[PDB]
């Protein structure tokens, strides 16, 4: 009876694709065909943050738009003051292989994890005056690839065991577990209202999840290879994905399908990181060619290149006030562009 | 300096953090790191008599070896973490002919990986005693799995250990030559393979790793100064 289930799945997919095609009246290229180009978008490196020993995998901006946290395989997190280029905190880790780090929106905690399948929460503000491990969340069966805070007592994680999870930090237990991906989940992006979030995995698939119920609302396909980075458009009705396909794609939640693609014939390397500007007009994406490209999201036209690193651009971020862009690379350097 | 007193104290704190980072820099740059690969039944667990991590010491040089085993079958993504390591130590069971082609394919995949294009490989052909016993017994035949064994002759530079049979030497050097011919097709001089014959009782493995790491460092330094 397996063939019956398979044919039911195929029929359902055919119904989904025809229902989707019933809405493609026009494309974003035609809708935004009469828009003035943004023009030459040139940025310069204002700060260069030096001090890490090995490749940097993760970074995260603070809500104040001034303090940021970065993670290196030497076994250290560093909190940098961007304005003064000062080191505020240097946190040694118990495991050298760290792949992600997050900064709490309140600013009282940081998180990290990696090949040790553990998510560590460090309390930044203690009476003793030093950073100490606040909690050690265990339960994933694969490397922790991403983590994002909701508040001081909730965190969402994605792992290499093809699942995501929502935790209660006080009890150290998984309040919810999100399953459905058939490959390693690489990145996740929380909604501005902290109600929904997407995950992209190494199966050319992105999934939209509701945190309160714990079910996959919609599934987006269209890539040809592993998705490495994912990020919402500011209003929350669209998101952008980058992959080893060497193409970025824009998906809209309401239309349940992609609207625009971003690629060039010269580009043959995959996208490691992706982010949006404050207004969503620019899409910033870092590649394996040691460069970041700026795309006119509404026109799919490249508008500029950030070329200052000498190795793979591993992490990228944009401040909450949209005033600066931070790019961290495998050459052990993190740069601020404005 | 157009700085407030608290700004100056923050600067001083950052300076102390930098001093600690410099000390950690010396400590970190002193130690060699190795990645241990090889399927099960190969005996990679017991190669050094000194399991996610392991420390050992050889003549005032520190080696730190990592065996990643608590993950899934797919290794396409996390393997990228190990692209700064000095060496990948690949262990292959040399007695089982039923799973040797899998070892060859794995070694090929590691050798040609984009993020492992500069890492050298120390190859340990483990379990030589079992291979010798199986060869002298005659029950198993390499020709069944590798037809090229018939049209093979022992190398001119092959060394026989004192007391042995030529068939055993032929088998050993055929096994070594398979990995070697895999290794001499895309290396381009950027990275090399160091094959060794080791049994279970062998205790020289650490010294071989030490010498191989010395050679790897010398080649890397020559290339960096653009002399080779």
């Amino acid at each position, epitope marked *: 009876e397996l063939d019956q289930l398979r044919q039911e799945a195929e029929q359902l997919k055919n119904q989904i694709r025809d229902a989707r095609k019933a809405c493609a009246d026009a494309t974003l290229s035609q809708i935004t065909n009469n828009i003035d180009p943004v023009g030459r978008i040139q940025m310069r490196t204002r700060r260069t943050l030096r001090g890490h020993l090995a490749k940097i995998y993760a970074m995260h901006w603070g809500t104040d738009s*001034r303090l940021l946290v970065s993670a290196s395989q030497d076994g250290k997190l560093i909190i940098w003051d961007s304005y003064t280029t*000062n080191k505020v905190h240097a946190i040694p880790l118990r495991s050298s292989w760290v792949m992600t780090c997050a900064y709490a929106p309140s600013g009282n905690y940081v998180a990290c994890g990696g090949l040790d399948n553990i998510c560590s929460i460090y309390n930044l503000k203690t*009476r*003793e005056g030093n950073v100490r491990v606040s909690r050690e969340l265990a339960g994933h069966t694969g490397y922790l690839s991403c983590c994002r805070f909701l508040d001081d007592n909730q965190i969402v994680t994605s792992s290499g065991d093809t699942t995501c999870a929502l935790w209660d930090i006080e009890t150290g237990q998984q309040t919810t577990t999100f399953t459905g991906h058939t490959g390693d989940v690489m990145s996740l992006s929380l909604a501005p209202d902290t109600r929904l979030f997407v995950s992209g995995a190494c199966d050319a698939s992105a999934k939209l999840w509701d945190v309160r119920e714990g079910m996959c609302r919609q599934t987006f396909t269209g890539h040809e290879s592993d998705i490495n980075a994912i990020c919402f458009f500011p209003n929350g009705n669209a998101f952008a994905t980058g992959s080893d396909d060497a193409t970025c794609r824009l998906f809209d939640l309401r239309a349940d399908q992609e609207l625009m693609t971003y690629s060039h014939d010269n580009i043959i390397c995959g996208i490691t990181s992706v982010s949006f500007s404050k207004s969503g007009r620019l899409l910033l994406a870092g590649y394996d060619d040691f460069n970041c490209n700026v795309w006119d999201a509404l026109k799919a036209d490249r508008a500029g290149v950030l070329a200052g690193h000498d190795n793979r651009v591993s992490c990228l971020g944009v401040t909450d006030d949209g005033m600066a862009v931070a790019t961290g690379s495998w050459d052990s350097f993190l740069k601020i562009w404005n | 300096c157009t700085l*407030s007193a*608290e700004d100056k104290a*923050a600067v001083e704190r950052s300076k102390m953090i930098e001093k600690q980072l410099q000390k950690d820099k010396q400590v970190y740059r002193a130690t060699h790191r190795l990645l241990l690969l090889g399927a099960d039944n190969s005996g990679k667990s017991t190669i050094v008599k000194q399991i996610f991590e392991t420390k050992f010491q050889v003549d005032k040089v520190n080696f730190h070896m990592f065996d990643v085993g608590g993950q899934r079958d797919e290794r396409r993504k996390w393997i990228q973490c190990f692209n700064d390591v000095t060496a990948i130590i690949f262990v292959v069971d040399s007695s089982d002919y039923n799973r040797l082609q899998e070892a060859l394919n794995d070694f090929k995949s590691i050798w040609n990986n984009r993020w492992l294009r500069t890492i050298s490989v120390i190859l340990f052909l483990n379990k030589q005693d079992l291979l010798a016993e199986k060869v002298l017994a005659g029950k198993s035949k390499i020709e069944d799995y590798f037809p090229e064994f018939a049209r093979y002759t022992t190398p001119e530079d092959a060394t026989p250990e004192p007391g042995e049979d030529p068939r055993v030497t032929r088998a050993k050097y055929f096994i070594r030559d398979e990995f070697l011919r895999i290794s001499t097709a895309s290396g381009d001089g950027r990275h090399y393979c160091y094959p060794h014959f080791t049994c279970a009782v062998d205790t020289e493995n650490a010294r071989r790793i030490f010498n191989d790491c010395k050679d790897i460092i010398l080649q890397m330094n020559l290339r960096e100064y653009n002399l080779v």
Partner: single-chain antibody
Amino acid sequence: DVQLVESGGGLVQPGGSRKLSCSASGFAFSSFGMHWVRQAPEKGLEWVAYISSGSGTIYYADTVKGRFTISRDDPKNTLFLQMTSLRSEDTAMYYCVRSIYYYGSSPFDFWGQGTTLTVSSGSDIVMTQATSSVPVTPGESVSISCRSSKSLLHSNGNTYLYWFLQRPGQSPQLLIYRMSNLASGVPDRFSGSGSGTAFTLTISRLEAEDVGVYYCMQHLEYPLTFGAGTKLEL
């Protein structure tokens, strides 16, 4: 928890020497800078010396230069004030204060108990507290005014004013740092406001625990200067 217990006080003859010790526990002593602050009998608070974390920077008050010296022993978590040529003017109670400096921190947060020492018989910012005493009943709201000789608003945008409270027979406690921030563990009812050279502290729903002496201090430049003190007698 945090302790900064001080010892070494007593009665001394004039022109003598004395060593004051401050033993700390429950916190990372090495990462904290240390201050000595002396309170004269029935007078205000006066700053003495500052040792930085790592001993890289040392500041002394002009009244104690040459005669006093500060030192620390990070392995043993102990602070030392060696004193020579003691005068009658040095008779005061010596508090030992901790202060950590980085972006977004609260210096002068914890003060030690103190120790009593008895002696037998110009480009300095001046802080002025208008009222030396304020009569008020519980449940009302009261304001304390502090004036500065020079603008405390620095080009970085931080107005370095600190508000402390000394309850009777107790060491001072931090209430406000940098003129707006509320220190950890301090009730919400306290609020701070100010503009450049005039600052106000507002205390809604005044209660019994809030009666004491209030001090305003500036951290813009060394030496550090305290106000005269406002005593909110019930």
